[PDB]
Amino acid sequence: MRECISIHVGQAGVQIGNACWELYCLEHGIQPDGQMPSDKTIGGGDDSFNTFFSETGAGKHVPRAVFVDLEPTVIDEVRTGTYRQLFHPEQLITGKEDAANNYARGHYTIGKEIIDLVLDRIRKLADQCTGLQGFLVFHSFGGGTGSGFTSLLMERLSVDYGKKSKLEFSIYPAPQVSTAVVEPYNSILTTHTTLEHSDCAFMVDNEAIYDICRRNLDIERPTYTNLNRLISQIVSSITASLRFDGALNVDLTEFQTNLVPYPRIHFPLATYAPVISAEKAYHEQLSVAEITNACFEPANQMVKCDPRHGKYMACCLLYRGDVVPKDVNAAIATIKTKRSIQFVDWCPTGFKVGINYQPPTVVPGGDLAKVQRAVCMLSNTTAIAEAWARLDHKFDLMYAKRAFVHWYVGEGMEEGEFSEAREDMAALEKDYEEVGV
């Protein structure tokens, strides 16, 4: 058993961490005070859930987690909420003033004076690990902390833990739910500074989560609570293979191996099905074929884009519930005849498949219906580069006019970091296009 550490940075990282740990406790039958009656090895263990929890003498199961915000108000809601006892005070790190939606503020000015406290708390968690394999980092592209402090953190983690893996769960900026206009700057900046310290990043476009909550959940104006419970469904689906018995994606190295053949193109697309409203009066349960086929509907992706105009480099299918291989094989066979799924010539056309017989756990009184089988497809398609184009284009429009740059330069950043990051992004877009057309 090799431990994983979760770092949640900034508001989106913290609140999504909340969702995920709430969900994990439900999935592993861990109560809000941290007792796990199912665990019979009291005060220790090397089961598969211990990848994500440690044990204390009282039988308290404790997330291998750290939360970091440059301002107190959100993690304060952690320190007082349903799962207050779950975490240890030293794990919840807050500042005084945040990065005011400024990448420079979180990376250089306000970051510098907190990076060492953060690394020391992370080291206190690592020293509790017998064989730490690396980090799952949750953050937004748009916030100041989420972008600038996360990239600072990422750099320092490469230094202090060079042989460990780092996986990102990224929240890509969506205007509908955004409160700041400089999110494209922050996004590009942080993508460029993190690109070589990230082994695999799962992007989630809030636009896609928002519209999934509108269409399939019939919520008229989705809140962060809605978005986060759906996001955590997807994230649990992706990390179950680390927290349960299995043979597919059992350590962070295998995520890179199975999903990222080219280390710069390390942004797999998640598609998830079925998302069904708990208010749905009559629901006909969907079949292995129906939900695997749903995996190739863009309406179910975490990023809106079109895999048909691009090429795949890898594809994993993660099922939860009543699934068995022959059904999956039949569904794949019949889908391949009716859909445009082209791989790069230097990769096998195929799917790595993982089934976990326990169906998805749903938060009581959430928006998601219980279903008897669900699936998360992880496809490394070059089509995701669509998002990059969007982001880059928005960035170009503002930066042509040097709009808002003074705010960044005034915190120590130089203007040249802007077009350094944009030129990295341009190289990234051209990588995607050469791979994919």
Partner: protein, 424 residues
Amino acid sequence: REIVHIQAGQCGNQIGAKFWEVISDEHGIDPTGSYHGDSDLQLERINVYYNEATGNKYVPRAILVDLEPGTMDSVRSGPFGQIFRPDNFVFGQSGAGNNWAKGHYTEGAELVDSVLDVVRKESESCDCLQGFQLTHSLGGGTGSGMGTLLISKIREEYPDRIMNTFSVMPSPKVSDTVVEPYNATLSVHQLVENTDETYCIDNEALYDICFRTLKLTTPTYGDLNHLVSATMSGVTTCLRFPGQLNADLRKLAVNMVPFPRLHFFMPGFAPLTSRQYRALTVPELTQQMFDSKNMMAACDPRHGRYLTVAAIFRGRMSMKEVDEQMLNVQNKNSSYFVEWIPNNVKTAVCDIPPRGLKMSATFIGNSTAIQELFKRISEQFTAMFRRKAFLHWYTGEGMDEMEFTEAESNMNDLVSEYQQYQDA
């Protein structure tokens, strides 16, 4: 967390006292400083503007400044006069006689350090001071000259806190003296350099609103100050009440101001209330809040482009409908928003409505049409300055004609800057 409010001069103190009456009513605090409302939402962010004093009494974080004691004695004698910490009244005796020099260089210079002493005492008793706000006119002497003198003092001592002004621009149709274009021009130069946001409240616009649409035949300074205090309540409401946006000063500053000098905001209020009972629909509120006739700077939004916009809705209403109506505005008038700042119109909501309204809306536009305001001043200025008229009131206090020539130049520069982006 904490904000420090300063009000300087006649106009500054009158509009500031109306501001504190209004928001004190909103937070359920009576003229003696005791709480008496129902919701706890009224007290959750109460320390943003009020200090908690012994007896759980709430004392505004307000400093009252004048170079003559008239208006502040009027304030201490007025409706909420006893709410203010009496130490926080800082006055000289001789007035400034509508003279920017007397405010900036001579009389105000003699009073400024004691005002700063009170500012400091209020600041060091803050956990997380986020910044300052000043209410003042730009056309008189204390307000404009000593207010901008204060602003640069505060910037020197607190270079990293936010500075916002609510600044009453002078119009000839509502005019005390003929030297107001001079006092305002000198002031705009300071304002362009040392504030983070400036709410341009043209007195012409206040008068027109009072007259045309409020059917007030002969508007008093009160009738104008009511509009101003309602508008200021609207723009501070997100700072003062808990909601889905933990609203602060710096984040609004960073998102509204693409260029450091172009930080002069067109404010507006809806529905426009007097001193009716028809209910507004969300499309109605939205159409009014973007109406040129509901804006407090006398500029035509259609004569420029919005660089950024903050809409703030107050009351209970459907977020879906608010979002649709905002989107319909931007999508049906997309010429008028610069395309090189994508998604430059941001909407917040506050669940608690103002006094006597179930729904209302507050508008903060950073539009290039504001150049019109500065052109007006500048024309008025040059009309006297090309004859050096009335300059003696200033050169007799130490100032040189060169300083006038510089302020004129800098405001013309600000006008060119706004033009640059109106055509980009």
